[PDB]
């Protein structure tokens, strides 16, 4: 199967772009392997790998655009990248048609 | 029909982990960082390391087949040391464990994490 896609945009609390970049899922990195199984298989999944990709700052917005609706484990990443920052985390996915939302904001 | 089963595997690892608002409960083929062959369930917990299952639960392998990965839809424990995964529609996967683990303590993992 072809490999999971996701657009992540950190924008801070001014406007300015801080990452734009594109991702995929699979093929883990020696940095991945070395946290150990299985966090290490759950660590390659796009929105853990994005939540990975970049610090945030307080105020900052990290929106990921997936493709599927978000796994367990994607979840907590976000959430726990979003409390953990002092940031907000925005997650979208097609579903019927329409780009779906959910949002974690850590409130410092 | 009889329920079809799609994967037959010896494991030599259980571990159990909530982490980051996320039950984990792996299947190792091998104790190495990189086993050659997986199942990992996972479900969202109300709280960090901790607090009530909660949500859709979700199955993944490293393996080549086809599943729904929301298709869990309970378990049963097989002799000799199998935990037998009842996958939709009508699909299972056996997970023979080696002697060592503890399969009732796996089995109440597996009650945690298919509760309500």
Known sequence: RPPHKATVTVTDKNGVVKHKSNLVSGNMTEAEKKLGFPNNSLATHTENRATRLIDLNQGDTMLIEGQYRPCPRCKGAMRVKAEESGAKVIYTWPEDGDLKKREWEGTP | ?116
Do not use: W
């Open chain 2, 1 to 116: 029909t009889k329920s079809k089963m799609l994967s037959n595997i010896v494991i030599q690892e259980v571990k159990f982990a909530i982490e980051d608002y996320c039950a984990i409960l792996s299947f190792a083929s091998d104790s190495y960082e990189v086993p050659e062959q997986y199942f990992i369930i996972t479900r969202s917990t109300t709280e960090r390391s901790g607090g009530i299952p909660e949500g859709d639960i979700y199955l993944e392998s490293n393996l080549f087949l086809d599943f729904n990965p929301y298709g869990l839809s309970g378990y049963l424990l097989s002799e000799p040391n199998c935990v037998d995964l009842l996958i939709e529609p009508n699909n299972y996967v056996r997970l023979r464990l080696i002697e060592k683990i503890d399969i009732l303590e796996v089995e109440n993992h597996l009650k945690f994490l298919f509760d309500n």
